[PDB]
Amino acid sequence: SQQVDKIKASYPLFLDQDYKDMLAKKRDGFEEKYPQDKIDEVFQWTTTKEYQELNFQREALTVNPAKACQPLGAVLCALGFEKTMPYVHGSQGCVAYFRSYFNRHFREPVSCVSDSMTEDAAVFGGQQNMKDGLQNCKATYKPDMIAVSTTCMAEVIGDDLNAFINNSKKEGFIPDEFPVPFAHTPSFVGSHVTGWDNMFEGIARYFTLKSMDDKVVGSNKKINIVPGFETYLGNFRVIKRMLSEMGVGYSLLSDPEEVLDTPADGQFRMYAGGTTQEEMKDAPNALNTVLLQPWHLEKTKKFVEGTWKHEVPKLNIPMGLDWTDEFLMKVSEISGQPIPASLTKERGRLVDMMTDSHTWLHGKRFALWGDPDFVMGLVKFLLELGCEPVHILCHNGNKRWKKAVDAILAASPYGKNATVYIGKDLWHLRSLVFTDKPDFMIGNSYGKFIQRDTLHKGKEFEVPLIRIGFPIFDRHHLHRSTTLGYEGAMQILTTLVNSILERLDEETRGMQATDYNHDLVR
Amino acid sequence: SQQVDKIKASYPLFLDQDYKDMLAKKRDGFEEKYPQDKIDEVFQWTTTKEYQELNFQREALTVNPAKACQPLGAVLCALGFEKTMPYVHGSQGCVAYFRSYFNRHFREPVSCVSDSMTEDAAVFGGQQNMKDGLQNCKATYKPDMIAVSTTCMAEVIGDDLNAFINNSKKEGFIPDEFPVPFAHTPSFVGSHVTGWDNMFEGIARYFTLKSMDDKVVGSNKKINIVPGFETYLGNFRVIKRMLSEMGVGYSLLSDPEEVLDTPADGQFRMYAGGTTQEEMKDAPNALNTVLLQPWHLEKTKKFVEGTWKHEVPKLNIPMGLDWTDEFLMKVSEISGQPIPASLTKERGRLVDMMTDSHTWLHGKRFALWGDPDFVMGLVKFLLELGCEPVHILCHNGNKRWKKAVDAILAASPYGKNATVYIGKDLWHLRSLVFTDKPDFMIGNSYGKFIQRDTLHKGKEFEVPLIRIGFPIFDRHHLHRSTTLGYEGAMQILTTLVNSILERLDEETRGMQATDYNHDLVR
Amino acid sequence: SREEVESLIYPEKADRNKHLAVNQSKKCIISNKKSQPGLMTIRGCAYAGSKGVVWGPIKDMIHISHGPVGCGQYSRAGRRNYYIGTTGVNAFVTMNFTSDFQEKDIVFGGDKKLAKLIDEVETLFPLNKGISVQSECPIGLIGDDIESVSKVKGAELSKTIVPVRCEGFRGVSQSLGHHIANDAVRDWVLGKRDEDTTFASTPYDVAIIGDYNIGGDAWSSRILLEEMGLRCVAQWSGDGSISEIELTPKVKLNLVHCYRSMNYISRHMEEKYGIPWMEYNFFGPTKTIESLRAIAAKFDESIQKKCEEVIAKYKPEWEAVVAKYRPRLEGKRVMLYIGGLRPRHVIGAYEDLGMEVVGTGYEFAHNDDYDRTMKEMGDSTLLYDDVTGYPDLIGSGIKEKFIFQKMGIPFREMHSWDYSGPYHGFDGFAIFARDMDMTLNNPCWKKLQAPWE
Amino acid sequence: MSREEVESLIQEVLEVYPEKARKDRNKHLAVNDPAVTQSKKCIISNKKSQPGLMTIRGCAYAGSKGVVWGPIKDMIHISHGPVGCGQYSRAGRRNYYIGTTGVNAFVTMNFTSDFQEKDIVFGGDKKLAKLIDEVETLFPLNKGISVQSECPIGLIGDDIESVSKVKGAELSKTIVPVRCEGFRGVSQSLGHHIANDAVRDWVLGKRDEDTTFASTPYDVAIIGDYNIGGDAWSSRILLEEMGLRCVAQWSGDGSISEIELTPKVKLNLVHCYRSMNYISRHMEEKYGIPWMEYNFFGPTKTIESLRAIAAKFDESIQKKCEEVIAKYKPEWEAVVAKYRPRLEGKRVMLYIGGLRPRHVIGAYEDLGMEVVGTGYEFAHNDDYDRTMKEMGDSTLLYDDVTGYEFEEFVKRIKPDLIGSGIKEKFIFQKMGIPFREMHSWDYSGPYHGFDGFAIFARDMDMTLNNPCWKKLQAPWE
Ligand code: ICS
Ligand code: ICS
Ligand code: CLF
Ligand code: CLF
Ligand SMILES: [Fe+3]
Ligand SMILES: [Fe+3]
């Protein structure tokens, strides 16, 4: 029953007595449910260290992973170029899932097409699919460039992207001069960041490999910036702002911030901004190339070093105080531009916020997960704040990255109780936060479920989730935030300290029980 | 007892069994406490409509006000001028409280001196106090200007600020050409915003009244911007940024954002930035003057229209979409500069954010309090979002402002159940949120106590607080936020929608009870 | 007019003309064919139609996304098929179980990996009541044989393991996924209690088939059905358990909500167990009352009397909802584009709120759905099958949501109910009317044009 | 730093003051001499502040309402006058208490008469009477009302004593008029004295002819502990563990009935001598109750104070004292073992109000830290008499130090840690010196007793050894 003056959605409509009775009747009559005591016993068992030992012996089963497949990152890379259509050779369900994922994260239209390969393509290949798809895409959406990745089906059946695109150009389906960069993105290798790396390397090789004869390093007095798989528009904005403040000429390669932040003015723009083809063609003429996320830009690094003859700096992700300082100093050395007083004042203001919040931030234990560069930057910043990143999980990390993070942790007295896990999923992290409880979790929206599980054990065992990373589905406009530079460091510090203070306020709100510590001033 | 490996602060140290036993012994033996049943009865009574009727009949008692005294606003205004020391003629305890308040809100040093008037000065005035204080302040802190306000003691005994300062310059305590603007700021008239208005009018009169012969309106091709009592640095920053985007020459009078955001670089800066005396002297030469918060700048408007001959536009606070649009259009008309494409894109992005989050924001009920202009701008923005501002409280509001807000509410379908209260305090609002429960409160940190009270009645009766306004003491770095312009509207919208989403997540986190609605995607 | 729509209706091949029509559908519209390559279609895959739709909502079963990590990751908890249970202990709907295929699994196969995964699932989740193995694209291309693994592990562990060959490249859309999942239900789960007669049956035994509890829609239907005197023995997939699927052959009537996704299993049950089935529409008070009366007409007079009692009880509530919200929604035109059932099932409540429907279309529906759709739509309205991205309200999915939002047209998510709901039943009608009013009449749609432009 | 260097530094700091200001400030700055027992020979205190010099001192209202009367939980305290004084002092002090706020406890609420122009012109006595009536109407469980006067009250000729008398006779309620106008005195010390006089005149003697209370030989009261972060609770648990019965608590978590029962105790334990010596001396001369100052800052001071207190009772109390010391020995020894190696040798400069600049020195010395500079905002010369023997030789002593003076002292001395209030915290954080709030315990605590020593050591280590202090200089400078 509904009151027209107060209409309830599913919550709390289904908490009504009639709905509760009907659900109880369903469960007692036909579900054949396990008794509540057995369910409680099994949950308590799952919260223990014996269950954690069983869980970490897992070899073939993955539960709640913290990574996606390569063509998602390939699509995100392709979205960063001017009037470029992402085109995923393979099955259309993959593209539907990619678009839904990015739609939920960014709350914006996401453009991507597929050639809709089917069982017929399973035998003869998707050559005709590629020809028809390129023709239809160019005719319908009129892009300046079509960036081609692959799904797992096309990779398994062994479709030759180069030969297929060349045949499409030779048979007149697309002009011979129309740019169709391609990349093989096997979804069973690496993760989405690997797909971003492969797509960027493919585009760079398409635009620069055959025209290196007239390229002179430093002849345009610019620095190439390759951001990698980035889902915060504020990160692109902060990098461009910091480089503009320094007076540094730069070319942001794969800049998708404009198409992911289109204004709602009454017309739909399928394309907006992005890296132009002229920028990508002139990229070998830059002074140097700086990779914002070097730990998933390995192939891009090999291409830039071996073809463009660029001495790529050994820079960490510009995340936090120290690494932002080193990034700015390296940029100043490369470009010859001194670091301006505005950036110095910004750094001083970040340090001032650190000194203001160090009392609440000190000693806090954290479980965090995400992509390798993001995770290591977050760990570095947390160590700079006097926090304890006890659990550091990276499903798509490798042994070299784990060694680097271990070296980072060893350099700090706050990384003594910190363990790095690679190849582990969020069920492993659930076991970790049950057996070795941290104060907070930092990660994407999936960690919310872990929080729920902790709340099931008790309010004193609940681990709140701080939503930093990708994808964030249950909160609005958090993709607009910044994680890089001093501005991103300030935003992260504010989020952390205010999460701590909100948790403390919630714990001390009990009247005549715990409200003696319900302080007005914190 | 304490464990060295895990040290407990007051919470949860005093939840220990021995501390609970000791507190129970104290209460049962010597506190002569009322029985818990009587306490519960009286609390339930305080939550009722009969108690609300008794509460709103109050005439002499004020409980938990939502305003401060005038010299606080005078100090805030004085801090916005270059190398200017706030000097409060009167008792030193007032200055100690002012500095403590602003230190707690901003987490920055706040410079302010007093002449320390005592019992003797209560008989023969504070002339000697003013002379010695002006000499001491100029010799010790070396300010370019001393801005003088008063405390209640100096107002009650009728100390003549003009005569005292003229005598101080006459006997040689301070140089005759040294700028010492003054303002009478009686704490028993108005509130802190009135003090800001009085101090700004005093400074403008001191610098421009006697030198109007050579002034020509519009001869410097600039617009004067008077921000009023503003405790968000982001608001100063956003106004300056938007005026720079349009290409409009501007003069922000009383700009304190630099001295309230000094970097931590190993040195302490007593002064930083601020409006220069040259800008104040040249202000009558501007095209026009724009008052950002017209409802507490009445004296300033009278002086500017009467002396400077500036046709001050009838403009609301640039809060929310429509009022930001009107402010930008008025600035475009005054300066002749067209509104650029960047501001149009920012407006479109704000509208896009409005459209993305309209499902969660529509129909939500808000109690809210603050200063008149901030409150009316927040009501306007809430009406633009489809929310219902049920309880609108302004302790320092007047009948004309209430009439204006009622006219705003009558022009929207969502202002039907809205009631505007002036002269009411936070105990009145506690009664209001108990008898007519809204979804959320919006106000300063004091509202946290009201939330506690609501949680004592039950979790279903709890009204969560959203901290927008002044002062915010229990959170860090929220003073860096923005409430003006499209950027401020986006920040407010994100805060509101994400507060709704956290509340929904908390209400649906119960496993096998309400977690059927614990949706990953919201 | 029809002439205008025809004039309103691409290389020479881009077929598209046959999938567009002005309202025997086969002579008017052509459906369930391959999508034109490179055209930004909305269609999913067979894996989405099987794992995400039919099998995923089953709560007490564990569903393994067999293959690489992406397909399982993107479909995790994306569908709001509501359920009651302790997640991770006895319910596993919002969890993602995947084999996470690597290069070596592609080269050498993942059958041994599948057996090891099944063993680990048994070890770590002992309270699971069954396992389903949803195949992704590489499984059917590398020659993996999950049927033999399922048989062997089911015999060994005495567990029901259902192999579903729902590879995404199969078929043209999720419809083949629905068919494959229905066949898997028939072959592995439905006939488990054929020789079991321990269930106590009543003359008023009904099962709910094809209701996926999106926002609690199936619960809102079930409360009305049980208030009517009927006993809902089975309700799958939404908030469904394996025992309910096994007990479905014991009911007296089948109530199919989504004909598109469960007509195969309904027809099979009618041929085998002789159980009559029929479609019901609980969207809007008019359709709800019509369906309740039609359902009561299949039983004795006591059920009809209880149906009249239920209708009379719920009449004032939906009448108040109409009185409140119809004045704010008269004369508003709606166009829709949803997967296979909703494009014709949602018209009733729009008409009950005084709204005119001028457009609808299907992602993957077959020509029988368009046969049903023709009568439900007025004349001169545009019908589209598998329409590419290239009125006052548009009701469609998330991917077109933002396109139509930025084109300025108020939009409603007709897949997930825009994270609201339920929309079925009288309570669902109240929620639906409130959501229609909140979306159509929001001020955000009046601010698209800058005042200086 | 040697004595001559400190004297020279004092001279350089004073060089920039005008003649009168420099002459006045030369009497409030001294080089400590632990052999000196008469502090008036080296330092002069409790004087007027020099105008326009950015002092830290508050007013008599702050010392009365904010310190003595405000912590009383079941009483309602009216800030009589304009709104500002009550607004800035609302919940700004962490005097912890147990109770239902708004029902039976009212510590963190702000009751004010909110004076307007008509109240200034025509007086606020009728407004005060009507306010008392409304307080009785809306807060029926209050066990007493106090009326703290703000500055205008004593300047417009308002007679609040008569209003309090009439309304108390009418309502059978204790209404205490406190004449704590801010202009009175020179600092919060006169506020403490006025509040103590009000307690003596209106609350303390309410049960003089009452004898129904059952007294025991081990009856003690805690006077002058305001429960900052639970400090009084951590002291009281130690006192009760020795077999003593703590009857009263002044005034943190303090009820009016405890104040009325105080004249029945056998010993008064005065933590803050500065704010409660008046009432302690009155209770000695009237009820014959001896009083003694104790110190629960750090383990050695806590142990010494516990033994001194137990020496005032029979041998059973001394046995229980030894048992408590033995029980808590391993815990504070573990705290020292963990944190002293991280803190040993560090130098501290302190500037707090009237008791802590000398009371917390032992806690710092327990961790291996030396205090090189200390001073008071409003202490008298007896506080300095107690301070010199505590401080080391050639250290710095400042009374009512100014912002310029204390900043220059820090610049020349360069301490590792500074303990002061909120109005210097961010100044010294920007200067780069680790800062600890020694007024609110930096929103931490308690710091009293053995349980407080662990928190104190952890907080000192956290602030002093934080990585942020190593990151103030940009690497490109
Ligand atoms: S199953 Fe089908 S696309 Fe019949 S795949 Fe799809 S929960 Fe749609 S129109 Mo999402 S044939 Fe159900 C459907 Fe309809 S997921 Fe839901 S709304 S009634
Ligand atoms: S009362 Fe005094 S200033 Fe003795 S007014 Fe002040 S809670 Fe200080 S040094 Mo804040 S004489 Fe207490 C004090 Fe000491 S408020 Fe507290 S810390 S021991
Ligand atoms: S049509 Fe369907 S969703 Fe597509 S793969 Fe095939 S079953 Fe799966 Fe999977 S990991 Fe990523 S998302 Fe694909 S490229 Fe492969
Ligand atoms: S020294 Fe002390 S705090 Fe000062 S007034 Fe006097 S009692 Fe009060 Fe009050 S309202 Fe504002 S803060 Fe003053 S100017 Fe008056
Ligand atoms: Fe958007
Ligand atoms: Fe700061």
Which DSSP string do the residues of B473-521 spell out, in sequence order?
-SSSSGGG---SHHHHHHHHHHHHHHHHHHHHHHHT--TTTTGGG--S-
Alpha-helical (H) ranges within B336-468 are: 341-356, 358-361, 372-384, 399-410, 426-435, 447-457
Mark yes or no for CB contact C442/B328 under 8 Å.
Answer: no
> For strand A145-150 and strand A419-422, is the pairing parallel, antiparallel, or unpaired?
unpaired
Q: Which two tokens stand for residue A121?
A: 């393509």
Give the Cα separation of B93 and D53 in Å (integer): 13
Q: Which two tokens stand for residue B508?
A: 């649906």
Give the Cα separation of B81 and B214 in Å (integer): 24
DSSP symbol at D54: -
Q: Is the CB of A464 under 6 A from ligand 3?
A: no
The answer to whether B264 and D472 are in contact (CB under 8 A) is yes
**Encoded amino acid at C194, one letter:** D
List, as ranges, residues 209-228 from B with C-beta within 8 Å of D.
none
The answer to whether D43 and D28 are in contact (CB under 8 A) is yes
Give the Cα separation of D176 and D183 in Å (integer): 20
Of A116, A109, A50, A59, nearest in space to A89 by CA: A116
Residue in B333, B358, B493, B497 to test binding to C, most C beta-carbons within 10 Å: B358
* Contact call for D and C: 3+ CB–CB distances under 8 Å: no
Instruction: Give the chains touching A; criterion: ≥3 Cβ pairs < 8 Å.
Output: B, C, D
Of A432, A323, A320, A324, nearest in space to A387 by CA: A320
Of A69, A99, B516, nearest in space to C94 by CA: B516
Resolution of this entry, Å: 2.6
Mark yes or no for CB contact A451/B509 under 8 Å.
Answer: yes
Q: Is the CB of C136 under 6 A from ligand 3?
A: yes
Q: Which two tokens stand for residue D349?
A: 């400069």
Of B456, B492, B158, B486, nearest in space to B345 by CA: B486
Q: Which two tokens stand for residue D12?
A: 């350089």
Give the Cα separation of A223 and A310 in Å (integer): 10
Of D461, D416, D438, D414, nearest in space to D360 by CA: D438
**b (16+ CB within 10 A) / e for D79-90:** bbbbbbbbbbbb
- Provide, as residue numbers in chain B, all residues whose Cβ is less than 8 Å from the Cβ of A515: 452
Instruction: Give the chains touching B; criterion: ≥3 Cβ pairs < 8 Å.
Output: A, C, D
- Provide, as residue numbers in chain B, all residues whose Cβ is less than 8 Å from the Cβ of D117: 186, 188-189
Whether A171 has its CB under 8 Å from any CB of chain D: the answer is no
Q: C132 - beta bridge partners?
A: C63, C162
The answer to whether B459 and B469 are in contact (CB under 8 A) is no
DSSP symbol at D151: G
Whether B99 has its CB under 8 Å from any CB of chain D: the answer is yes
Q: Whose CA is nearest to atom 10 of ligand 2?
A: D439
Whether B97 has its CB under 8 Å from any CB of chain A: the answer is no
Q: What angle do CA B419, B424, B425 make, to 5 degrees?
A: 120
Q: Which of C45, C207, C232, C234 is catalytic?
A: C45
- Angle, helix A341-361 to helix A233-245, in steps of 10 degrees: 140
Q: Which of B25, B139, B189 sits opposite D18 (nearest CB)?
A: B139
C232 is catalytic: no
Mark yes or no for CB contact D475/A321 under 8 Å.
Answer: no
Q: Which two tokens stand for residue D100?
A: 């239902």
**Residue showing tokens 């609440």:** A360
Mark yes or no for CB contact C171/A118 under 8 Å.
Answer: yes
Q: Is the CB of C424 under 6 A from ligand 1?
A: no
Task: Spell out the residues 6+ positions from residue B123 whose beta carbon is closer than 8 angstroms to its own.
Answer: none
CA C363 to centroid of ligand 1, rounded, Å: 10
Q: What are phi and psi of B369, to 5 degrees?
A: -150, 165
Strand order in the sheet with C382-385: C20-22, C382-385, C356-362, C333-337, C393-396, C411-413
The answer to whether A194 and A70 are in contact (CB under 8 A) is yes
Q: Is the CB of B114 under 6 A from ligand 4?
A: no
Solved using: cryo-EM
Q: Is the CB of D355 under 6 A from ligand 2?
A: yes
Instruction: Give the chains touching D; criterion: ≥3 Cβ pairs < 8 Å.
Output: A, B
**DSSP string of B50-99?**
HHHHHHHT-SS-EES-S---HHHHHHHHHTTBTTEEEEEES-HHHHHHHH
**Residue showing tokens 């619960």:** C219
Instruction: State the nearest Cα–Cα gap between B362 and chain C, in angstroms.
Output: 7
The answer to whether C301 and C308 are in contact (CB under 8 A) is no
Q: Which two tokens stand for residue B440?
A: 């959320």
Query: Whole-angstrom distance between the N-terminal and C-terminal Cα of chain B?
Result: 46
Shortest-distance ligand to the CA of residue D151: 4
**Residue showing tokens 């620069």:** A208
Q: Which two tokens stand for residue C197?
A: 């007669």
- Angle, helix B127-141 to helix D19-26, in steps of 10 degrees: 80
Burial (CB < 10 A; 0-12, 13-18, 19+), residue A213, is exposed
Task: Spell out the residues 6+ positions from residue A17 whose beta carbon is closer than 8 angstroms to its own.
Answer: none
DSSP symbol at D235: H
Q: A388 - beta bridge partners?
A: A365
**DSSP string of A198-249?**
HHHHHHHHHHHTT--TT--TTTT--EEEE--S---HHHHHHHHHHHHHTT--
Give the Cα separation of C175 and C259 in Å (integer): 11
CA D371 to centroid of ligand 6, rounded, Å: 27
Of D265, D296, D295, nearest in space to D280 by CA: D265
Other C-beta atoms closer than 10 Å to the C-beta of C33 total: 13
Q: Which of D77, D80, D93, D359 is catalytic?
A: D93
Q: Which of A33, A136, A268 sits opposite C90 (nearest CB)?
A: A33
Q: Is the CB of C70 under 6 A from ligand 3?
A: yes
CA C54 to centroid of ligand 1, rounded, Å: 10
Q: Which two tokens stand for residue A500?
A: 């701590």
Of D261, D253, D269, nearest in space to D306 by CA: D269
Q: Is D246 annotated as a binding residue?
A: no
**Residue showing tokens 């190696």:** D341
- Provide, as residue numbers in chain A, all residues whose Cβ is less than 8 Å from the Cβ of B448: 505, 518, 520
CA D84 to centroid of ligand 4, rounded, Å: 6
Q: What angle do CA B296, B300, B306 make, to 5 degrees?
A: 140
**b (16+ CB within 10 A) / e for C294-318:** ebbebbeeebbebbeebbeebeebb
Burial (CB < 10 A; 0-12, 13-18, 19+), residue A333, is exposed
Peptide bond into A12 cis (omega under 30): yes
The answer to whether B260 and B107 are in contact (CB under 8 A) is no
Query: Whole-angstrom distance between the N-terminal and C-terminal Cα of chain C?
Result: 34
Total count of residues recorded for chain B: 522
Give the Cα separation of B424 and B395 in Å (integer): 5
Q: How many angstroms from the chain centroid is the CA of residue A346?
A: 26
Shortest-distance ligand to the CA of residue C262: 1
